[PDB]
Design a protein around this ligand. Structure first.
Ligand SMILES: [Cl-]
Ligand SMILES: [Cl-]
Ligand code: NA
Ligand code: NA
Ligand code: NA
Lengths: 135, 157, 158, 135
């Protein structure tokens, strides 16, 4: 899986996700990446999210939309919403992976509960950060 | 204030079993794509066009499991999925189970912009994309030795 | 406090466009299926078995756009979709774009129980179900002259 | 589209949804019906939901999960959650249709913004009610 989320100069949020799926899946298996609210979600009022990992659990948990709902209805910050979904609820259902998220205030979060997540981010006109491992 | 994040997959990556030569390949790929997105954002391009282009470049990159470098099914095939969503309109497009489109995220953007629909699957998605001038590819273009070895390793029991 | 609800579709059901005899057939089909669900619940059947059986009956009923009585695509084919979700485990199973399975909801339930997946599509979903003994059917079994006349009306519209 | 939701004597919730889609559909088009959180959702902590209407809008709004999130995080009752989704949020996105929902307390709701929804409900050991039109 790969993904991108962005906040532009006009205050618009967007998200995109693409994948091959999981090695040795049954032909016809669909994971979270093409399901709105599971692997991909964007809403200017809340957040843009793209997920990666054990797709089945991201579908059952509606991981991407849950970030948005925990912020919108629960009043959680991006950091709290990401902690709650990736570090508590996904692992409780046997899920592993992570996600990238930007809220409407331009906060960014790259939570993952795995050993690694190939990732990068940067504000417009600034130095990007790249990551593979934790921290 | 304008910002982009990208990812190329989460999973079991041990420093222990990884060469620095191999790590710098991923870092350089990730840096080049995030910098393309950063430059598009500062130049005033839409969030929607930025995430579309970043994911197209991640598909193109054989190191990441999307497009070129996709994993194999149980039957040694590639079946690809993508989604794009516009937070301004809450419009979205998605394809699942496509094998003959080079860039699933471009097909997903075509569902968003040139259909009244959100999700298309299989040969139906492919026919819709062909009807709008998207080129037909052989799924063999996605295949890599690395993902082939991981399939053999998966089928061990 | 066991309870069931069912639906057979929301839309432009116009009184001036329906016959009483049609309305009575709908009422009878809905009352027969909801009573079956109530009786299962009363006998201590699981909520999962109850929703599975009620949707299976709504599929079988040619009055409703699912299974037998499915609408036609642009190409005069049938493509069927279904989902089931168990609130106790949060497990789920779904199929989309299937043409050769009589009861999508039963295939959806097989995906939930006998695959490590949540969603299967098209021929892959069909082959998975056939390997576990579900019957392969012709999609002509779903076809009804009512839904066909609706396809012609929709084509005349544009 | 057809569907069912139930609460059993052991307190468990479940939902199921099936469809042939829309008359004259583009082959390969997928509506809300088979998408977890769009056309079908159940969670013993909140609600069981089955939807019917313009599938595209039910996906974009994640209507079935939205009922659950509105109750669980928003503190809305079933009736208030159903009102907000079916009579405000979906029409605002050009969405028409309805859904059936039972919450973990055994409340039942059959909201719809259309002329009709084929529907029925009953408590274990009481008499069933069937409906076609409004009222
Ligand atoms: Cl690192
Ligand atoms: Cl009535
Ligand atoms: Na790639
Ligand atoms: Na694949
Ligand atoms: Na039927």
């Amino acid at each position: 899986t790969v993904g991108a989320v962005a906040l532009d100069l006009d205050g618009n949020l967007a998200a995109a996700t693409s994948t091959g799926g999981t090695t040795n899946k049954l032909p016809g298996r669909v994971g979270d990446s093409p399901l709105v609210g599971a692997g991909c979600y964007a809403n200017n009022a809340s957040v843009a999210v793209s997920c990666t990992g054990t797709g089945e659990v991201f579908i059952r948990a509606l991981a991407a939309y849950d970030i948005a709902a925990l912020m919108d209805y629960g009043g959680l910050s991006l950091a709290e919403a990401c902690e709650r979904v990736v570090m508590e609820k996904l692992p409780a259902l046997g899920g592993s992976g992570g996600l990238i998220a930007i809220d409407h205030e331009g906060n960014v979060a790259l939570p993952f509960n795995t050993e690694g997540m190939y990732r990068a981010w940067g504000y417009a006109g600034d130095t990007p950060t790249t990551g593979i491992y934790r921290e | 204030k304008a910002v982009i994040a990208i990812h190329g997959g989460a999973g079991a990556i041990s420093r222990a079993q990884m060469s620095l030569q191999q790590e710098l390949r991923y870092i350089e790929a990730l840096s080049a794509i995030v910098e393309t997105g950063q430059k598009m954002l500062e130049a005033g391009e839409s969030a929607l066009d930025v995430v579309t282009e970043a994911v197209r470049l991640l598909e193109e990159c054989p190191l990441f499991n999307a497009g070129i470098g996709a994993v194999f099914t149980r039957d040694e095939t590639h079946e690809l999925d993508a989604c794009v969503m516009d937070g301004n309109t809450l419009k979205a497009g998605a394809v699942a189970g496509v094998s003959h489109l080079r860039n699933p995220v471009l097909a997903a953007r075509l569902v968003m912009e040139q259909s009244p629909h959100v999700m298309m699957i299989g040969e139906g998605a492919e026919n819709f994309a062909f009807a709008r001038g998207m080129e037909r590819v052989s799924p063999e273009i996605f295949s890599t030795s690395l993902r082939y070895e991981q399939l053999l390793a998966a089928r061990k029991e």
